[PDB]
């Protein structure tokens, strides 16, 4: 079982698993976090697949041409250190911070194991394969692009099209002057145009058309009243609480845990922040509902203060064989410091730097803080500048000296009772029962579409669903329903999928399949009809112009529905904007570039109408022609126009993507 192919070479689910594995570790080790959610993981699956496909496409061409990235070139790139991919790298010189190739040279010598953070070899192995794949693609692209030369005819034309400017009067009849229902479009004409243009209507990947119902279960009134009651009881207890807020706030199961420390305003829930100025120290700010996270809440400002946000301090830790020695040793060290011994000197004596450091409340804001961490951080915030303290920390001691305090901000302790208004199981079971009764009573697409409204369900619509989309209707956990949709037959109705975050229910009706090949006539009917209509309107207008024997500008302006305009500084290069038509008309410049002065043109079929043109003036920008500069601009234009060549390699690469059949 393989997840896809390109160029007749398949990728097995095993290798695909390994690469998405590889890429996730790399994504976590670079965005900070240590796990991603379901939609981020899907982004990672798609990047790995996209990257695999593009490199396979390039490799088949590079192999034919003999484009390679040799080991010598890799060494050259590595020694240089300037490739964008070698910038935000682990291997950096300790002082410069830039890529050092020399420390990278790492040994092949690792109960002979010790430690296994030398799975770093797999990380660098990824950076290096990305390097060579990207260098290969770049070599290939540059050879194509730089071969797209210009020439002097194309350079002279581009200059002429820009600097020759024309001024012309216009008379036009807009297409809107003819009512659509007066033009007859026979089915034989739609079929003829379709067959004539059939190669324009390819369907490259199979798509399907579905309807689906997406139910979300939300708390009932009795559900919300039961949680309002629990917050009311917790608010009354919070009012009569005077200490041990950490344990009380945990004991009522708040979504917002309490730490006995001062934090900036920003550390608290945004709905709490919004209310802090109206809150008084020691008074519960009574129950309130917050829509943005569906919670009922109350809180109590335990205390307010102005204190330093940044604290400078040096320290020295004291561990010894036992408790007796630890205490004796820490007391001796404390004595020396208070007598004026140098901190750095004494700290060296027990194998520590003893250099001052800084600490801001942002480095612990948000973490779970307890035990020795809470004791330590409380000690730093309650020690005066230059004061020394001997802090006992369970097993150890730490001699601590605060040297400086800056960034005095308003800080707070706030005990928050936050409870989400969740639905009961009774509520969920009612919704599940109603939905299953509806599905079973309407087990065909015809019945589901006809009866959804009367049963109270919103029938949603999705055309051209592709099997690479992961979900139905954006709902989390519906990849099974997508799988089902691509194996069902038109008319079928799926089962009830439980999805979302245990709060959504989805059913899917399959209404149509558009297999790979050609899009059917019906799928492109509207675009074909509109083209046929425009062509027939233009025929009618030009027929009316001939019956009127219109031979001068004034006779054209006298026809039913005619508008006129004066078009100045027309060029071939840039399409003329025509106020009278509210439309852009590139054929104006085409005509003007070869027109005779003061001669009325024949009727021209434009975008918004049929028009005639009569030029009355001409001039040139004064720019000097420079063939080398014109050609360089055109050459770069060619490169831009061909920058999507991977798409063409894709179309000939016979790429198949069966990832949805497995994950």
């Amino acid at each position: 079982h393989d997840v896809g192919e390109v160029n007749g070479d398949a990728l097995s689910a095993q290798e695909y698993q390994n690469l998405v594995e590889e890429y996730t570790e790399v994504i976590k080790l670079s965005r900070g976090v240590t796990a991603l959610n379901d939609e981020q993981t899907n982004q990672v699956r798609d990047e790995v697949w996209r990257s695999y496909v593009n490199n396979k496409l390039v490799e088949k061409e590079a192999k034919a041409l003999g484009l390679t990235v040799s080991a010598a070139e890799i060494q050259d790139i590595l020694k240089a250190g300037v490739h964008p991919l070698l910038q935000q790298t682990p291997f950096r010189n300790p002082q410069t911070g830039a890529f050092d190739k020399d420390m990278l040279n790492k040994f092949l010598v690792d109960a002979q194991y010790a430690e296994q953070y030398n799975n770093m070899y797999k990380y660098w192995s990824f950076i290096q394969k990305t390097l060579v794949q990207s260098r290969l693609a770049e070599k290939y692209q540059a050879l194509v692009a730089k071969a797209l030369l210009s020439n002097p005819v194309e350079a002279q034309d581009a200059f002429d099209a820009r600097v020759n400017q024309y001024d012309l009067l216009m008379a036009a009849v807009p297409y809107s002057s003819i009512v659509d229902s007066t033009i007859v479009v026979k089915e034989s004409e739609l079929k003829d145009l379709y067959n004539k243009k059939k190669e324009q209507f390819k369907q490259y990947q199979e798509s399907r058309d579905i309807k689906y119902i997406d139910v979300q279960v939300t708390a009932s009134a009795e559900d919300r009243a039961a949680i309002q009651q629990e917050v009311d009881e917790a608010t009354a207890q919070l009012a009569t609480t005077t200490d041990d807020y950490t344990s009380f706030i945990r004991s009522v199961g708040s979504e917002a845990p309490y730490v006995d420390l001062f934090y900036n305003k920003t550390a608290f829930p945004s709905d709490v922040v919004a209310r802090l100025d109206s809150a008084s120290v020691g008074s519960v700010y009574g129950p309130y509902y917050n829509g943005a996270d569906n919670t009922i809440n109350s809180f109590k400002v335990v205390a307010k203060t102005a204190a330093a946000d940044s604290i400078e301090f040096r320290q020295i830790q004291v561990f010894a064989e036992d408790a007796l020695k630890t205490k004796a040793l820490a007391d001796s060290i404390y004595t020396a410091i208070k007598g004026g011994a140098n901190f750095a000197d004494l700290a060296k004596k027990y194998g520590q730097t003893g250099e001052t450091n800084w600490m801001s409340s942002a480095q612990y804001e948000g973490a779970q803080i307890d035990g020795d961490n809470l004791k330590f951080i409380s000690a730093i915030n309650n020690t005066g500048v230059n004061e020394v303290v001997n802090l006992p920390l369970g097993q150890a001691n730490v001699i601590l000296q605060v040297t400086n305090k800056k960034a005095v901000k308003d800080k707070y302790k706030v005990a928050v009772v936050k409870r989400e208004v969740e639905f009961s199981k009774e509520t969920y079971n009612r919704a599940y029962n109603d939905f299953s009764q509806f599905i079973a009573a309407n087990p065909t697409a015809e019945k589901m579409i006809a009866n959804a409204e009367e049963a109270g369900y919103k029938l949603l619509d999705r055309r051209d669903l592709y099997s690479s989309e992961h979900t139905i209707g954006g709902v989390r956990g519906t990849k099974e329903a997508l799988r089902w949709a691509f194996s069902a037959k038109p008319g079928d109705v799926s089962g009830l999928y439980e999805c979302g975050e245990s709060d959504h229910m989805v059913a899917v009706a399959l209404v149509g399949v558009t297999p790979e090949g050609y899009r059917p006539l019906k799928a492109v009917q509207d675009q074909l009809r509109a083209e046929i209509v425009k062509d027939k309107k233009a025929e009618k207008i030009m027929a009316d112009m001939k019956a009127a024997n219109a031979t001068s500008l004034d006779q054209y302006k006298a026809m039913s529905g005619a508008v006129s305009d004066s078009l100045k500084l027309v060029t071939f290069a840039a399409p003329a904007y025509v106020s009278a038509l509210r439309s852009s008309e590139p054929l104006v410049g085409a005509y003007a570039s070869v027109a005779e002065m003061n001669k009325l043109s024949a009727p021209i079929k434009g975008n918004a109408g049929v028009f005639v043109l009569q030029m009355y003036g001409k001039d040139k920008l004064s720019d000097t022609f420079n063939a080398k500069d014109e050609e360089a601009t055109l050459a770069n234009m060619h490169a831009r126009f061909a920058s999507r060549l991977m798409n063409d390699l894709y179309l000939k690469g016979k790429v198949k993507d069966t990832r949805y059949l497995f994950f």
Binding site: E61, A64, L65, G66, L67, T68, V69, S70, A72, E73, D76, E138, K139, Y140, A142, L143, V144, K146, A147, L148, L149, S150, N151, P152, V153, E154, D157, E199, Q200, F572, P575, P586, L587, G589, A590, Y591, S593, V594, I604, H638, F641, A642, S643, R644, L645, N647, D648, L649, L651, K652
Partner: protein, 173 residues
Amino acid sequence: PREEKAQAALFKGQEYFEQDAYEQALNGDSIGYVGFLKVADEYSGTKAANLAKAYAGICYAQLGKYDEAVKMLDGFNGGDQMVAPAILGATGNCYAQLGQLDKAASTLLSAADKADNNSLSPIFLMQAGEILVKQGKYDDAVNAYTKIKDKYFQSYQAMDIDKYIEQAKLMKK
């Protein structure tokens, strides 16, 4: 291992070429890279030496040496979708630089047929169409441009192609 050595002798020229340093890509630097001409002679028979002829031909054209460009570009042999048609298209553009307009137009039309794709065929068809218009061959220009409209309708050039068809029709007169 002849191909491996040839590929190591080539890669520095591929760097110069991408930085528009065409003289050193072509004739070598003085610090170990010998240039495309010497790669193609020293490692003849390898894919690297075949590639070196395409690179050298583009170098000559960028340096204004279009006769040498044409001879060198002809030495490249390939049949892929992208590089080989672009090299043939580059040859047609060098013919245009030398005033051989008939040969330029037929080469470019050939490059477009060999490429047969949205990224390259319309570039060469436009260039052929403009040369055919300069020669007064308006019906042939209309056929080149119509090919962009009919077969390469998803290309950027197809968005703008109607003004070129109309101008060439109007010059029949």
